[PDB]
Each structure stands twice: as structure tokens, then as C-alpha cells.
Design a protein around this ligand. Structure first.
Ligand SMILES: CC(C)C[C@@]1(C(=O)O)C[C@H](C(=O)O)[C@H](c2nccs2)N1C(=O)c1ccc(C(C)(C)C)cc1
Length: 549
């Protein structure tokens, strides 16, 4: 079973594509080494096609079926409802790709008779026909990185009308089923504060902790027809309306399992027999399947008191050490089992005995201290990709503002606070756009957020301590500092100076602006203001699922 077959028609862009970092008058103030930042384009799609295209073999044993039965028993306790057309329309992002059939995302949200009538017709066809593959578009993503070049990632998605029907049939299921089935292991239920707390508590719950990340090579491609049918059998355990059962069976047979791929010019590029990246069930499906395969590999490997944390294809296991030699051997058996289940590693997993050395959701635990000097754990990452993207967004308006998502999700970090907040608040001040709502993504869902709302968002997701962290670790400081030399970003001392300016400017404006100056930039003044609570999201993952929050 090959993950894809190809005709030889090219994956085509739908618009002009920039690969070189755009530069304006603000660029050099953030980043000098411009030639290190690039965006992927369709020109590299051929290279990605080669990576994602392979044969899958699967060998399924008793541990696999044992975990599956347990998951199904939990899933049987879920009661889910159909969403009305209206409800599903309201979940559609304002800038979601328009339909081939003469209406767009705004027509959908506005419940135009054209959009609604077509959606009813798509729904009825799902009920009537559980056989015919549904068309999908394949595109090369344009994403920004620092050199050391990756090929474009590919996205596969059905028409807007289908996307709305998906929401009707499955939004409630994908929202509620995974936490029921996986409990505390379900990663999307945690804000960053809750996630770091769960990781630390999980780590402290072991007599002698051992943990590891497992990186599956090209997870979407490893997903087989079996996996997707197993997923459907899980959804079908829920207490559902008969009409929902039928639409889910239909979406599975006609879309989820596979189908034809069409380029932006309407030419046939080939055929998919693996996970589509751009459907509603991508995140929930990947999470279930990763959790199933890994729970079964843990038993194969005889790992003791395994605690998993799963976000799609992102997987972390923390368990009881059996000793160093025993743990390394167990990890090999875990990997052999994952491989048989069709999920071979990209890089071999490594046992860790220090929590801060485990990377999960591209992040690691680290520690700083609050106002009182008490230890605070928080999640951070190498800032290289966030800063390359910030540089891009400095000179170019983009559909999604990663700088804003990074400020929200990495608010307690040295680099988000000193660089991202300082840089973008300065830019927003200059343009008097503090009040302008901007689109960003959190766990792949789309939010419209005004920068002026940041103080309360951060306090909720991270705690008040986020505004007073200091004495960061030498390792964390060292990683940030070396990233800045690599990219030609000004040293942290320059950012401190800039932040004092930005801060003073914000305070003057009173109201919300002054709240941003006071809370976001307290780290920048030598005699700190006493920071006190302020007056005036994490249920499930929907990456690729076209969800507006
Ligand atoms: C600008 C980003 C903040 C947006 C992004 C997204 O999924 O839409 C993409 C980000 C990415 O790494 O691709 C990050 C995610 N990491 C792992 C899964 S999702 N993203 C997160 O939303 C995200 C950041 C940080 C975190 C933790 C710090 C690990 C809580 C979870 C999720």
C-alpha cells in the first residue's frame, strides 16, 4: 500500500510565491543576516513528494487490539450531537478558501441562501452515497525558516461545502471524544501553564523517572487505510444520531481513507491512500492513532507505569526507570513495535533522565524565578524559527501572524518578552494599530485578537508570574544569545533599552495601552512596579480542520 501515487502533473501555486526575505525600513532593527531566512514554495514540491511517498506494512498483535478495545469502551460513553448548518457556518474562518461552487467563507458565515443551499445539497449527497471518492486540492505550503533548506510541506483539503458538512457530522465528536478516550494523556486539553504543570507533576510522580519523545517519520504518510477505519470504528462507538452515523461512514469511505488529488489549475496530480492534512479529523485522528500505537508499544516493551502525552503525531512517554541499560533496551523494543504498527522513527528515541532535555510539541521545560524568587517552570523553545518568521512578518502582511501566536504561547520566555513584545509593540505604536484585531493560530485553530488584549490572555494561560520571571537558566540564556548571533539580531541589552522606550510610550495612552506597558514591560524597568491581578481555548486540537474560535 503506497501512501500516494502520482500522475506527473505538477503541484501548482495559486498565486505568486516569495522565497527571499522581504526587507523594509524596519527589517535591520530586528535581523541583519537576511540570507539565512527563506520561505518554501511549490518549486520544491517534487522533493517533498519523494519523502512522503512510500509503502506501508502493518502487523497488528494482541497488545494493539487490547488497547483498541479499551479505547472503544471509553468512546462508548460519549454522546455527541449533529451541528446545524448555522452552527457549522459560524465555525468557518472569515478567510477560509472559497468554494469551487460559487460562494465563499463570508457567504457561509453570513448564511447566504446560495452557500446554505449548496451545503444542504452536499450533506444530502453524503447520506445518499457512501462510495464515491470526494475531490481534494493539493498545495505546497509557503512557510518561513532559517537555513540549516527544507522542501515545502503539502496540504490536502476538500471543498468549502464539504468542510462545513464535516463540522456538522464531527465537530462535537472530535471536540469531546479524545479527552474521554485518552484522559490526561490528551495534549490539547492543556493551556501552556497546565501542560508544564502536568509534565512536571507526571515526572515527579515516578520513583525514578525516565522519559522520551518519539518522532515518527512523516506521520501522515504512515497512516494506513486500517488506521482510518479503526478511527471510524472509535467514532461509531459514540451515542450518535443515525444521520450522523451515516455521514461519518460516508466521510470516512469517500474522503478520510483517500481520494484523488487535484492541483490549483484543476489537473489530476494523483491519488492519496493516507491521512489528508487538511480535514477536520486530522488532529483527532492522528492523536487517537498515535496514542493507540504507542500505548500498545509500551506493553510490547514492558515499560513500567507509562504516562503518555500526545498531540497529533507528537508523542512523549514518561515512565518508571528499570535502570539505564534496561531502559535503553526497552526503548528499542518500543521502536520495533511502533515500526510493525507502521510508525517507524525519523530519529531513534533516546531515554532522558532530565525533564528539560525532552522536546515535545517542539518545546522543553525550563525554570526561572518570580518576583518572590520562587521557582517557576515554563515551556520554551529555540527561538530561531519564531524570529525568522517575525522578520518576515515585519516587512510583509501575512494571513496569519505567527509573532502574535508566539507571544501568546511563549509569553513567559526570555525571547518572546524581550524581543517579540518589544519589536511588535513598537511597530504597532508607530502605526496606531494597537486596537486592530489580528488573525493568529493556536493549536491550528484561528483566533482574531487585538494586541491590547494581551495582558489578560497571558495571565490566564500562564499565571501572573509570566510578567515577573527572571534569573532564567544559563542554558536557556545561552541558547537565546547564540540564536541572536546566528541571525544577526541585536543582543538582549539593546532590547532592554528599546523596551523602556516602548513602555513609556504605552503608559502615556492610558487605558488598555498603559496596562500593556505596565504588565508586558515590567521586566524592563530597574525598580519594578508591584504587579497585581488585572480586571477586564484549550479543549481540543483542530490543526488542518478549518476552525475559527
Ligand atoms: C505561532 C504558534 C504558537 C502556533 C502553533 C499552532 O499550532 O498553531 C504552531 C507551532 C509549531 O511549532 O509549529 C506551535 C505547535 N507546536 C506543536 C504543536 S502546535 N503552535 C502552537 O499553537 C503551540 C505553541 C506552544 C505550545 C506549548 C508551549 C508546548 C504549550 C503548544 C502549541
Amino acid at each position: 500500500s503506497m501512501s500516494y501515487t502520482w500522475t506527473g502533473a505538477l503541484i501548482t501555486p495559486c498565486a505568486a510565491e516569495e522565497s527571499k526575505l522581504p526587507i523594509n525600513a524596519l527589517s535591520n532593527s530586528l535581523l541583519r543576516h537576511h540570507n539565512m531566512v527563506y520561505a518554501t514554495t511549490s518549486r520544491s514540491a517534487s522533493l517533498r513528494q519523494k519523502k512522503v511517498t512510500f509503502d506501508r506494512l502493518q502487523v497488528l498483535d494482541d497488545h494493539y487490539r487490547d488497547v483498541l478495545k479499551e479505547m472503544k469502551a471509553k468512546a462508548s460513553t460519549v454522546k455527541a450531537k449533529l451541528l446545524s448548518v448555522e452552527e457549522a457556518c459560524k465555525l468557518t474562518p472569515p478567510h477560509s478558501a472559497k468554494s469551487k461552487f460559487g460562494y465563499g467563507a463570508k457567504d457561509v458565515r453570513n448564511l447566504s441562501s446560495k452557500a446554505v443551499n449548496h451545503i444542504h445539497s452536499v450533506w444530502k449527497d453524503l447520506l445518499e452515497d457512501t462510495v464515491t471518492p470526494i475531490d481534494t486540492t493539493i498545495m505546497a505550503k509557503n512557510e518561513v525558516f532559517c537555513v540549516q533548506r527544507k522542501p515545502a510541506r503539502l496540504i490536502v483539503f476538500p471543498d468549502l461545502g464539504v468542510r462545513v458538512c464535516e463540522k456538522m457530522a464531527l465537530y462535537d465528536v472530535v471536540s469531546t471524544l479524545p479527552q474521554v478516550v485518552m484522559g490526561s494523556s490528551y495534549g490539547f486539553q492543556y493551556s501552556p501553564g497546565q501542560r508544564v504543570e502536568f509534565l512536571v507533576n507526571t515526572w515527579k510522580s515516578k520513583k525514578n523517572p525516565m522519559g522520551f519523545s518519539y518522532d515518527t517519520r512523516c506521520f501522515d504518510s504512515t497512516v494506513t487505510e486500517n488506521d482510518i477505519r479503526v478511527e471510524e470504528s472509535i467514532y461509531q462507538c459514540c451515542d450518535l444520531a443515525p444521520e450522523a452515523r451515516q455521514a461519518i461512514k460516508s466521510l470516512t469511505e469517500r474522503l478520510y481513507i483517500g481520494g484523488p488529488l487535484t492541483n490549483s489549475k484543476g489537473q489530476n496530480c494523483g491519488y492519496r491512500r493516507c491521512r489528508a492534512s487538511g480535514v477536520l479529523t486530522t488532529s483527532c485522528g492522528n492523536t487517537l492513532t498515535c496514542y493507540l500505537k504507542a500505548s500498545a508499544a509500551c506493553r510490547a516493551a514492558k515499560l513500567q507505569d507509562c504516562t503518555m502525552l500526545v498531540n497529533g503525531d507528537d508523542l512523549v512517554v514518561i515512565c518508571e526507570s528499570a535502570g539505564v541499560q534496561e531502559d535503553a533496551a526497552s526503548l528499542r523494543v518500543f521502536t520495533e513495535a511502533m515500526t510493525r504498527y507502521s510508525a517507524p522513527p525519523g530519529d531513534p528515541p533516546q531515554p532522558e533522565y532530565d525533564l528539560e532535555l525532552i522536546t515535545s510539541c517542539s518545546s522543553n521545560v525550563s525554570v526561572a524565578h518570580d518576583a518572590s524568587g520562587k521557582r517557576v517552570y515554563y515551556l520554551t523553545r529555540d527561538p530561531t524559527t519564531p524570529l525568522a518568521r517575525a522578520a518576515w512578518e515585519t516587512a510583509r502582511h501575512t494571513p496569519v501572524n505567527s509573532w502574535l501566536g508566539n507571544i501568546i504561547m511563549y509569553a513567559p520566555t526570555l525571547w518572546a518578552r524581550m524581543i517579540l513584545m518589544t519589536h511588535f509593540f513598537s511597530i504597532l505604536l508607530a502605526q496606531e494599530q494597537l486596537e486592530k484585531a489580528l488573525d493568529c493560530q493556536i493549536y491550528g485553530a484561528c483566533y482574531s485578537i487585538e494586541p491590547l488584549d494581551l495582558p489578560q490572555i497571558i495571565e490566564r494561560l500562564h499565571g501572573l508570574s509570566a510578567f515577573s520571571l527572571h534569573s532564567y537558566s544559563p542554558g536557556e540564556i545561552n541558547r537565546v544569545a547564540s540564536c541572536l548571533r546566528k541571525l544577526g539580531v541585536p543582543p538582549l541589552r539593546v532590547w532592554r533599552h528599546r523596551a523602556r522606550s516602548v513602555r513609556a510610550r504605552l503608559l502615556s495612552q492610558g487605558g488598555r495601552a498603559a496596562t500593556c506597558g505596565k504588565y508586558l514591560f515590567n521586566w524592563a524597568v530597574k525598580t519594578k512596579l508591584k504587579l497585581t491581578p488585572i480586571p477586564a481555548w484549550f479543549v481540543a486540537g483542530y490543526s488542518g480542520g478549518d476552525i475559527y474560535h
